[PDB]
Amino acid sequence: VVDGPAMLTLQVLAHNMAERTTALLCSAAPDAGANTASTTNMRIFDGAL
Amino acid sequence: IRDLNPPDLNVLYYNGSRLSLLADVQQLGPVNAELRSLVLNMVYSITEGTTIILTLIPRLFALSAQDGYVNALLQMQSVTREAAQLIHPEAPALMQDGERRLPLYEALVAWLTHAGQLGDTLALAPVVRVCTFDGAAVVRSGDMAPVIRYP
Numbered sequence: 382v383v384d385g386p387a388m389l390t391l392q393v394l395a396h397n398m399a400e401r402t403t404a405l406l407c408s409a410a411p412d413a414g415a416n417t418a419s420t421t422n423m424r425i426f427d428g429a430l
Numbered sequence: 431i432r433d434l435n436p437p438d439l440n441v442l443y444y445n446g447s448r449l450s451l452l453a454d455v456q457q458l459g460p461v462n463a464e465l466r467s468l469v470l471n472m473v474y475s476i477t478e479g480t481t482i483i484l485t486l487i488p489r490l491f492a493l494s495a496q497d498g499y500v501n502a503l504l505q506m507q508s509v510t511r512e513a514a515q516l517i518h519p520e521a522p523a524l525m526q527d528g529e530r531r532l533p534l535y536e537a538l539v540a541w542l543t544h545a546g547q548l549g550d551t552l553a554l555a556p557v558v559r560v561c562t563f564d565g566a567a568v569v570r571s572g573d574m575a576p577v578i579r580y581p
Contacts, residue, residue, distance in 0.1 A: 418495040
């Protein structure tokens with residue numbers, strides 16, 4: 382149940398809009414205090430939307 | 431050398447024993463005699479091949495990552511660990527009469543006769559070593575020992 386005049390507040394969507402969801406791969410590895418000559422090449426791949 | 435410059439250096443270690451040493455003042459005369467004996471032998475190791483050896487400073491700091499035996503060099507108190515972090519040197523080129531001569535060989539032999547000699551130049555020579563006959567691996571503090579000359 383929504384009041385009448387509060388419906389007209391939706392005009393603010395004409396001021397701010399967005400486009401598509403974008404996929405992500407993020408890779409920064411391994412964080413400090415772990416990086417050793419044995420462990421350089423391996424990565425941690427994570428994702429986000 | 432601290433006394434010419436208006437911490438700390440007292441504590442030694444050997445066989446796990448903690449021991450310091452008693453000293454109050456040092457006369458400014460003999461320190462200059464020790465210091466002049468240093469810096470003349472310090473300078474006489476620097477030859478043309480040494481700058482070629484200085485280009486291997488980025489190699490050691492990369493190699494101490496991979497082997498712990500190279501980590502046994504730097505000890506975090508050397509200059510060369512923090513010197514490699516800032517200075518990236520590179521070689522001069524090309525050397526005069528480089529065909530006939532060996533610059534890396536000449537830098538080492540001059541180094542072996544001045545800097546590697548300097549353990550003899552400050553103190554006196556190690557004339558005597560120890561050869562127990564009935565084999566005692568440890569000669570205890572307060573006891574005699576057999577004694578044979580050292581070359």
